[PDB]
Structure 1
Amino acid sequence: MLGNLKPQAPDKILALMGEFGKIDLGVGVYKDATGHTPIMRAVHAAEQRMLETETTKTYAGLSGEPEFQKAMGELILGDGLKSETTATLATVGGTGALRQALELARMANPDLRVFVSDPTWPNHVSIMNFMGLPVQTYRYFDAETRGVDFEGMKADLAAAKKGDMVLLHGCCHNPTGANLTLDQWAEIASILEKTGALPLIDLAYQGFGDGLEEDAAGTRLIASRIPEVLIAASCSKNFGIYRERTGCLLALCADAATRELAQGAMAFLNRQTYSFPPFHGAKIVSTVLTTPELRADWMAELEAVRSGMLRLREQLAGELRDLSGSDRFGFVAEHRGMFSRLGATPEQVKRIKEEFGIYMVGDSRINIAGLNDNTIPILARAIIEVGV
């Protein structure tokens, strides 16, 4: 039977990792001055504390632990968290949350379609194709200005109908690095409540843009306006626990009844897929979030990380400017997050990796965290050489 298995297409980023004076600017992970993805101080201390506190490993919560559910909701929605109308499900990372999100929605609407940003995280489309869900795209990135084509984005969203879902990146847009301003979010919230489109928000980098609270701004704004929203959150990057596989899905409902339904359907969704969700990472998160000392240090370390990358973008932007006189690559300093699409054509990007030894995703997505004072001028010179 297994011989009928058709060969499946590889994931670009994972494959890029395969093809890797080498410069790793591919996969979206934070790296320090010495090319390492360290473990956060609070995370380590949490784990040490867990080693002493835990006395059992019996089956726990089917939808995650109360502490994880509550601490995550507060971190995301702040004071906009209305427990009585909010359903929470602990999942296997953000990706698990996204998949569970699409499953929940499709159960509620067998005829749903999903709009995604042009461009968006490749894995978004793969999951949707696999489930067989109709994918539509809304303009978002502006090829020329490297910013957001907001006039076009609004145009496309207006075509969304009731029952459709619109996937929005809460902050730090992957792969572009181009992000909406709170003013732009308020307008989208207007369109959404006119169309009736259910918004699904991919919150994977809360803390890498402008700050823990600031990066959650747009999400809090949508949640305040739209009576029903879905948020797929990830603790992989902002907590640096990538391999622990921890995130969660929040279902904001209009009332307690609808909320009770969702919560039930969410628990069931976990039961029929893998039973209980992974505990270790979730426990690290809540332990950090509910322990003032730990939370304080974590916030501090995350701030240091978000600050450093900001400094790097400026160095890089400057390096390029002085390397060409033109302030064309200014968009790099304007972008926010870990990625930024250089705009290099497919034929140019290949030159870079084969000759310059610098590996960046084929669509010119560079993980700014992969740069440093030593490699920045090299990258700058490298792309100047590649010209047009």
Structure 2
Amino acid sequence: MLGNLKPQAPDKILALMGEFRADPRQGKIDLGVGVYKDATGHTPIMRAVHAAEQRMLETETTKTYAGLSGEPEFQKAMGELILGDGLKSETTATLATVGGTGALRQALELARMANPDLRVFVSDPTWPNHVSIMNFMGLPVQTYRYFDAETRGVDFEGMKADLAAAKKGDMVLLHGCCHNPTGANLTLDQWAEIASILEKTGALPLIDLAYQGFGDGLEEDAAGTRLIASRIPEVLIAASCSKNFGIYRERTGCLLALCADAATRELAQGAMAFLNRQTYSFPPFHGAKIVSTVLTTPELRADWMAELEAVRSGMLRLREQLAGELRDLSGSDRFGFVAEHRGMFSRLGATPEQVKRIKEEFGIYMVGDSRINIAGLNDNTIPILARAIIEVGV
């Protein structure tokens, strides 16, 4: 029977990897990585996280089945981290998931469960995995303009014009912050206008909050999400702990369902629990327990925020340096967007030809859409990348 199976395409993160490894050049650089790496090219385990694991190893006495939709400590801590004081426990349903991707997949299953004729609007461009999951589910996908290739900023007028076509019951996927892959983000004022269009259309917003803490700060990064949450009755939020907690492989995510009333909340919470049951019964415990422990233990929460802040500031300085280098070389402020972008990613706006030419002549690797990871940069690699960009005529 298994012979009838249609061949499925590989990730692609590995094809780029195999090519990079095969390159015999001593000065080759990899800006295609999708995770944070420090100065030494390593992805460390955050201090507070290692502290939580030592703590868990000494206090945990059992590993019996726990909470179906997650542990209360985790659900509450995550809700407070994302929504702050605006958290309305009475109308908020929460579900621990297998990473942010699991939260996204579940959000989609939940929405389709409530609205079979669901259509989803995604940004142009967006995290490729969004479309993949949606295509796999058979969901109708619609695109809304977002990245302005020329200014490398947000084409807001276009975004607004396209979103205006959304009908009641449709879902609009928004990146809460640090837009992957572009790095171009909405201002709080633009968020406010988006809220108006959403109220008008009656479209359900799904916020992908995977980088809270890498933009302008923990609270700052959740600002857009909190505005949407307070002005829109029903809101779906799929959060990730992979990057901001540095526990990628542990698979710790969270799905928040903001409902108009408690009756609906019980309905949503029950359906979410049912969704976990029919997929894998219970969600992973380890990562979630690390998170709730860090968040509930003052000493740890403190050290964690301090390490995240150091990380954010470090990347922000890398941006400033690159932008300055490019300013000095270009004799213009065209590349200023690099210092305006937020997150660990940025789309340079180079064409595939320019991308290939950069690799061949300078040994610098990056995603085919010209997306680079700022964390993979440093004092020694910045001058090289800058010169490369100018030389290939970007």
With the length of structure 1 as denominator, give the TM-score of the two structures. Answer: 0.98
Deviation per CA, 1:107-130: give whole Å up to 9, x if none: 001100000000000000000000
Q: Is the Cα–Cα contact under 8 Å of residues 120 and 140 in structure 2 kept in the other structure?
A: yes
Match of 1:228 in 2: 234
Task: For residue 43 of structure 1, give the secondary structure of its aligned residue in structure 2.
Answer: helix
Deviation per CA, 1:188-223: give whole Å up to 9, x if none: 000001100000000000000000000000000000
Match of 1:50 in 2: 56
User: Aligned runs of 1:129-168 on 2, under 5 Å?
Assistant: 129-168=135-174
Measure the CA separation in 1 of the matches of 2:310 and 2:48: 14
Tell me the CA shift for residue 32 of structure 1: 0.6
Measure the CA separation in 2 of the matches of 1:315 and 1:62: 47
Tell me the CA shift for residue 23 of structure 1: 1.4
Task: For residue 277 of structure 1, give the secondary structure of its aligned residue in structure 2.
Answer: coil
Q: Is the Cα–Cα contact under 8 Å of residues 14 and 27 in structure 1 kept in the other structure?
A: no
Q: Is the Cα–Cα contact under 8 Å of residues 77 and 216 in structure 1 kept in the other structure?
A: yes
Measure the CA separation in 2 of the matches of 1:52 and 1:92: 25
Unaligned runs of 5+ in 2: 21-26
Tell me the CA shift for residue 2 of structure 1: 1.1
Tell me the CA shift for residue 14 of structure 1: 4.4
Tell me the CA shift for residue 311 of structure 1: 0.3
Matched positions, count: 388
Measure the CA separation in 2 of the matches of 1:366 and 1:130: 28
* Pairing partner for 1:333 from 320, 331, 339: 339
Measure the CA separation in 2 of the matches of 1:115 and 1:356: 38
Measure the CA separation in 2 of the matches of 1:17 and 1:265: 40
Q: Is the Cα–Cα contact under 8 Å of residues 319 and 377 in structure 1 kept in the other structure?
A: yes
Measure the CA separation in 1 of the matches of 2:237 and 2:217: 18
Deviation per CA, 1:303-342: give whole Å up to 9, x if none: 0000000000000011111112121111100101111100
Tell me the CA shift for residue 17 of structure 1: 3.2
Measure the CA separation in 2 of the matches of 1:64 and 1:351: 49
Tell me the CA shift for residue 8 of structure 1: 1.4
Tell me the CA shift for residue 18 of structure 1: 3.7
Task: For residue 315 of structure 1, give the secondary structure of its aligned residue in structure 2.
Answer: helix
Q: Is the Cα–Cα contact under 8 Å of residues 321 and 327 in structure 1 kept in the other structure?
A: yes
Deviation per CA, 1:235-282: give whole Å up to 9, x if none: 000000000000110000011110001111101101111111011000
Measure the CA separation in 2 of the matches of 1:31 and 1:338: 10
Structure 1 range deviating more: 7-16 or 221-230:
7-16
Q: Is the Cα–Cα contact under 8 Å of residues 28 and 363 in structure 2 kept in the other structure?
A: yes
Tell me the CA shift for residue 15 of structure 1: 3.4
Measure the CA separation in 2 of the matches of 1:19 and 1:291: 44
Q: Is the Cα–Cα contact under 8 Å of residues 122 and 144 in structure 2 kept in the other structure?
A: yes
Measure the CA separation in 2 of the matches of 1:210 and 1:248: 22
Task: For residue 26 of structure 1, give the secondary structure of its aligned residue in structure 2.
Answer: coil
Task: For residue 216 of structure 1, give the secondary structure of its aligned residue in structure 2.
Answer: helix
Match of 1:113 in 2: 119
Tell me the CA shift for residue 170 of structure 1: 0.1
Say whether residues 1:66 and 2:72 are aligned partners.
Answer: yes
Measure the CA separation in 2 of the matches of 1:164 and 1:312: 39
Measure the CA separation in 2 of the matches of 1:382 and 1:29: 23
Structure 1 range deviating more: 4-13 or 41-50:
4-13
Measure the CA separation in 2 of the matches of 1:345 and 1:187: 32
Q: Is the Cα–Cα contact under 8 Å of residues 317 and 332 in structure 1 kept in the other structure?
A: yes
Measure the CA separation in 2 of the matches of 1:22 and 1:270: 44
Name the % identity.
Answer: 100
Q: Is the Cα–Cα contact under 8 Å of residues 75 and 94 in structure 2 kept in the other structure?
A: yes
Measure the CA separation in 1 of the matches of 2:223 and 2:233: 17
Task: For residue 53 of structure 2, give the secondary structure of its aligned residue in structure 1.
Answer: helix
Measure the CA separation in 1 of the matches of 2:57 and 2:216: 34
* Pairing partner for 1:365 from 354, 371, 375: 371
Tell me the CA shift for residue 28 of structure 1: 2.1
Measure the CA separation in 2 of the matches of 1:167 and 1:191: 14
Measure the CA separation in 1 of the matches of 2:125 and 2:217: 24
Q: Is the Cα–Cα contact under 8 Å of residues 313 and 332 in structure 1 kept in the other structure?
A: yes
Tell me the CA shift for residue 102 of structure 1: 0.4
Q: Is the Cα–Cα contact under 8 Å of residues 33 and 376 in structure 2 kept in the other structure?
A: no
Moved over 6 A (4+): none
Taking structure 1 as reference, are residues 15 and 81 closer, same or farther at Cα in structure 2, changes over 3 Å only?
farther
Tell me the CA shift for residue 357 of structure 1: 2.2
Match of 1:314 in 2: 320
Tell me the CA shift for residue 22 of structure 1: 2.7
Say whether residues 1:3 and 2:39 are aligned partners.
Answer: no
Measure the CA separation in 2 of the matches of 1:219 and 1:170: 6
Deviation per CA, 1:105-154: give whole Å up to 9, x if none: 00001100000000000000000000000000000111111110111111
Measure the CA separation in 1 of the matches of 2:16 and 2:136: 22
Measure the CA separation in 2 of the matches of 1:17 and 1:215: 31
Match of 1:90 in 2: 96
Task: For residue 280 of structure 2, give the secondary structure of its aligned residue in structure 1.
Answer: coil
Task: For residue 153 of structure 2, give the secondary structure of its aligned residue in structure 1.
Answer: coil
Unaligned runs of 5+ in 1: none
With the length of structure 2 as denominator, give the TM-score of the two structures. Answer: 0.97
Task: For residue 232 of structure 1, give the secondary structure of its aligned residue in structure 2.
Answer: strand
* Pairing partner for 1:79 from 71, 78, 85: 85
Task: For residue 178 of structure 1, give the secondary structure of its aligned residue in structure 2.
Answer: coil
Q: Is the Cα–Cα contact under 8 Å of residues 12 and 361 in structure 1 kept in the other structure?
A: no
Tell me the CA shift for residue 9 of structure 1: 2.3
Tell me the CA shift for residue 13 of structure 1: 3.3
Deviation per CA, 1:67-96: give whole Å up to 9, x if none: 010000000000111011000000000001
Deviation per CA, 1:20-40: give whole Å up to 9, x if none: 323121132111111111010
Measure the CA separation in 2 of the matches of 1:306 and 1:219: 19
Q: Is the Cα–Cα contact under 8 Å of residues 143 and 343 in structure 1 kept in the other structure?
A: yes
Measure the CA separation in 2 of the matches of 1:145 and 1:16: 27
Taking structure 1 as reference, are residues 14 and 123 closer, same or farther at Cα in structure 2, changes over 3 Å only?
farther
Measure the CA separation in 2 of the matches of 1:234 and 1:329: 30
